Amino acid sequence: PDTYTSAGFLSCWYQTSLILPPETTGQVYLLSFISACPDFKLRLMKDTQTISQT
Amino acid sequence: TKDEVNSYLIPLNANRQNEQVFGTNLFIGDGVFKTTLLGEIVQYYTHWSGSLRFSLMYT
Amino acid sequence: VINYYKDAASTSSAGQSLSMDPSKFTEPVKDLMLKGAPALN
Amino acid sequence: VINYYKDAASTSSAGQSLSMDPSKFTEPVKDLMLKGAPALN
Amino acid sequence: QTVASISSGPKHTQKVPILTANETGATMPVLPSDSIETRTTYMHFNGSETDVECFLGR
Amino acid sequence: QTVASISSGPKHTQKVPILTANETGATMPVLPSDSIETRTTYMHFNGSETDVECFLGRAACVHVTEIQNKDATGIDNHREAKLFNDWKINLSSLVQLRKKLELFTYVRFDSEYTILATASQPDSANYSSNLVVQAMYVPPGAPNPKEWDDYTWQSASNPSVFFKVGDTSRFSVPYVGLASAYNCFYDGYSHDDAETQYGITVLNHMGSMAFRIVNEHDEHKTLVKIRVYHRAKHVEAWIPRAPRALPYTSIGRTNYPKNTEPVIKKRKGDIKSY
Amino acid sequence: GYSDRVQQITLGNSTITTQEAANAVVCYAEWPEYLPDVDASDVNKTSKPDTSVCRFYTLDSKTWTTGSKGWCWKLPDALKDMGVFGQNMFFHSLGRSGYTVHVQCNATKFHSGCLLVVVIPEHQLASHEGGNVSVKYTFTHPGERGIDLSSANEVGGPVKDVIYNMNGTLLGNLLIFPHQFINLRTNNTATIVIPYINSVPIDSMTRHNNVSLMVIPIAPLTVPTGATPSLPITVTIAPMCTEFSGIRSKSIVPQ
Amino acid sequence: GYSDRVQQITLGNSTITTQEAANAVVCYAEWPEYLPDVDASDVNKTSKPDTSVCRFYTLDSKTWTTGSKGWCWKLPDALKDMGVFGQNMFFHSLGRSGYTVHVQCNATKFHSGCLLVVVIPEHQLASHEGGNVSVKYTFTHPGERGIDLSSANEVGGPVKDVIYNMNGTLLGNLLIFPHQFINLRTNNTATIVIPYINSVPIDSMTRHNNVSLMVIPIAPLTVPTGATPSLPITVTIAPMCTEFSGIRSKSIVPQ
Ligand SMILES: COc1cc(CC(=O)c2ccc(C#N)cc2)c([N+](=O)[O-])cc1OC
Secondary structure: OOOOOOOOEEEEEOOOOEOOOOOOOOOEEEEEEEEEOOOOEEEEEOOOOOOOOX | OOOOHHHHEEEEOEOOOOOEEEEEEOOOOOHHHHHOHHHHHHOOEEEEEOOEEEEEEEO | OOOOOOOHHHOOOOOOOOOOOOHHHHOOOOOOOOOOOOOOO | OOOOOOOHHHOOOOOOOOOOOOHHHHOOEOOOOOOOOOOOO | OOEEEOOEOOEEEOOOOOOOOHHHOOOOOOOHHHOOOEOOEEOOOOOHHHOHHHHOOO | OOEEEOOEOOOOOOOOOOOOOHHHOOOOOOOHHHOOOEOOEEOOOOOHHHOHHHHOOOOEEEEEEEEEEOOOOOOOOHHHHOOEEOOEOOOOOOHHHHHHHOOEEEEEEEEEEEEEEEOOOOOOOOOOOOOEEEEEEEOEOEOOOOOOOOHHHHOOOOOEEEEEEOEEEEEEEOOOOOOOOEEOOOOEEOOOOOOOOEOHHHOOOOOEEEEEEOOOOOOOOEEEEEEEEEEEEEEEEEEEOOOOOOOOOOOOOOOOOOOOOOOOOOOOOOOOOO | OOOOOOEEEEEOOEEEEEOOOOOOEEHHHOOOOOOOHHHOOOOEOOEOOHHHOOOOEEOOOEEEEOOOOOEEEEEOHHHOOOHHHHHHHHHEEEEEEEEEEEEEOOOOOOOEEEEEEEEEEOOOOOEOOOOOOOOOHHHHOOHHHOEEOOOOOOOOOEOOOHHHOOOOOOHHHHHHOOEEEEEOOOOOEEEEEEOOOOOOOOEOOOOEOOEEEEEEEEEEEEOOOOOOOEEEEEEEEEEEEEEEEEEOOOOOOOO | OOOOOOEEEEEOOEEEEEOOOOOOEEHHHOOOOOOOHHHOOOOOOOEOOHHHOOOOEEOOOEEEEOOOOOEEEEEOHHHOOOHHHHHHHHHEEEEEEEEEEEEEOOOOOOOEEEEEEEEEEOOOOOEOOOOOOOOOHHHHOOHHHOEEOOOOOOOOOEOOOHHHOOOOOOHHHHHHOOEEEEEOOOOOEEEEEEOOOOOOOOEOOOOOOOEEEEEEEEEEEEOOOOOOOEEEEEEEEEEEEEEEEEEOOOOOOOO
16 A cells, blocks of 8 residues: 555445335345456565464 | 454445445555455555456345 | 476476466356346346 | 576666767757857847 | 557447346456546556466565 | 868858857857867767766665674564664665766666675674575565564565675666656655655655574674665666755755755855966 | 747647747757557546647746846646646546746846746755755645745745755756746747656646746846836746546645 | 347446436437537637546436426536536537436336436526516526426526426427436336537537426326335436537636
8 A cells, every 4th residue: 555556446326226125124235346357467576464473 | 343244245225315335445455455366466466557347246 | 598407397487378368267157158248138 | 698597687788879869958949050050040 | 569458439339248247157357448438558568477487486 | 980070171151150049048069160270080989988878887885784693582672673674775875876866857777786794793702603694675565574583584475685694695676666767856745635745755665675694693793784786777867957966865855954065166266267 | 031039839729929039949859749559558538628728828927126036836736727727637637748838028128137947857846944854745836826936935845045956956057957048138038848758658737746947037137227126027838738537526635 | 139228328437327228319310429610600629628528427316206396407507517517618608519318217116107308409498477577597507406396486587387398388298309208117217318409500508508408207106005205316417529619717607
């Protein structure tokens, strides 16, 4: 995370609303996924902060 | 409070209008993204560029 | 790039594979799905 | 000049550019000015 | 050499590339040019540093 | 080959090459042959030594730091005790090379580093230890060492070099800028914020170089001083600017000291004095 | 029949004329142009308002007195509140542009004075506090009023000694940058065409000023006996080959 | 494999999708286009912001209740405060544009209701006062909030009886204008592409509204037993082939 190179923000809103049918009260959920496009590039290999020991 | 299947469930509420569902900055190497396959691999490198593919599946 | 040693293990790194086919992971479906066409027809 | 290493950064210095055009700094004027002719005509 | 993004303009069709069904188990190769108007750009990149040979090669 | 001056004789014309108008912003290429009678002479010179590739193409010291080998028992802050040390990579800490680089606005090149480590035993010691230094590059985002013996020194992905003290380490690094060239100056900020930092200090987040001594401690204490040298190769430079005139005060910013001696020499006499 | 002295410049629906110019300067001999595919990175299709933003905008005239030190403007900052150009600056994440700068100052054949008009790419200012103090966003974004080099320092602002170019380099060498002089006995105006100069294809137009324009009196102003001891200086700037990219909500900047 | 039901529309960096549409209407079978030389009069070279103004802008959602009468918006008025499009409207003397209107309203297979979505060129409203009273500028320029046909009259405003189309003609014949229906049991959205329709090549975008968009409930809303007695209606509009001409200072309009 670096400010000069920030990527922006992602948000989601109700365009109209969620409507449930009769006899339905259960909670409704969304599953979100993330992946890269063929567009993608990564450089300068380095160690990760996601593992350690001690 | 702890890691759990619910961390992946984005709640959606009936009869709410123009309200916000969720938000996040796009530091793919941290935040919500940090543990994902993309975030995990991205962290093995210093620089990145390109376009991201973000999708939502209704349940 | 002259190999000073007799065994293959002695040689240096292989150099870029240059294959790069992600579809066996991104699209391992039985029936081909065309971008733009109904995912579920 | 045999490159022992795989990457370009490994190679030694580039050698003289041999371009040498100072005019983009000494004469960045819109209308060409000929030596000997009135600077302001 | 390789194009990173092709030039794509306005759109109004029955071919909706951004509507899929992730329960199929596939990650449809959707591109920015499928949901926004884009200009042409090139890769200028081969991805040599992310080759498994390089990743485990140090 | 090339002529330095052509043969030129007497002159009496309406073509006055030596009368110009510097307010146009141009420096008309007037020659001696335009105002005096000259003979023919040749250059016998190519100007190879003033090529930017040559100008920035030699090693210059860019940083000096210190680490030491001693008992780590009880030490809470290893970094402070200098059991290991850091270097927030930057090329504007030592002024000599900095002034050269700042002769231009944008600069692009590969870098060839040479790291020299010298030992010193100020207190009583029976011998000079044979220490091995480990310089590990910690790119922004990589975990920083906290103790001279972290798991971090495994350096599985971070590149690092091991070499004997007294010896020298050498390797080159490709142009790592995120843009097409490095900025020697930056009239901007990281974002539109009222208090955030100004200058290239915003663009220069190149990471750190962690130095340590692999050996365990000996009975005595050994002081190792580390000097990093930088040589540019495959050079490209853009937008030349006015040379630095006043002394520097900080890494990255153009700030100059309050109350500085005048830079321009003052005549010992008249404006007519030779 | 023609002359460097007389010129006309037309951009959009604006036209400036001068009958006492001294040619014109095109920075590093390069005319401004749009961003070519080969150099582009940002995949968004750009917006080219053309005539609605590529026109002459005239800033408030400054007053040259016998004691003026000089003035400094910054681009694109100086035009942030100028018509549609300004609006586009804040509504877009990115953008690039070139300009045609036209500085005006007329007197009589009895006056005397010489202004240096220069364009400095990446003019990183210095803090008058020295040490490692920074220069707050507000102070390098004066807007069309620009920075007055004869005004007093202020907490968080830049140093203003004309002599050290506000950055620790001597005034005399400012000539290595594309410049022109307005020497009253010769000149009446100064014109400089600026192409996009940056290490990136396109950039943020609010957090980064690509160049600063300086009008510095070198030979002091002198007026004939008993005349008003001042002359006005006017700056007119026109963007050209302007591209905007990544449109979103309007940006909110410090103060 | 394709269907009128499923559609995607991409303009600028905005894309709308629908899986329950009923085809789409292109007013008088004509797609919007730019102003050709042969028809032009104004000699000024125009400005075409393209992607920065030709994108989807979403207005505040209305609430359809069992007693709603309908709503009426006007273009370009409805988008006067929408990003760069709005800015260009006030900074230019003239301009022309077409649009893609997308009205959204979803319910369940248990609900029932039918909205008429129509585009009326030159929708000259009538004064509820009758006689020869006029309708003050403010009241025909509601902005993105639009006019609520179930709100009370107000001094200087227009009449609002849904039945007489606010102009003395019967609702039932509104179908002679390019329209579409959002019949909950079939529809989910309505889409109408509007080309520039005027008796002049280009016009003032502030003193004249070229068309008004109306969303009128015909078959009243009915919800299943015990359900919330309302549904939201959302309007999204995107300008296309937008041209601006005669740039000057920003216009100041009534209130
Ligand atoms: C030898 O120490 C290293 C130094 C560097 C930094 C580097 O090369 C650099 C040079 C000039 C400029 C400018 N202006 C910015 C950065 C990197 N690095 O950046 O990756 C790695 C090192 O060890 C892998």
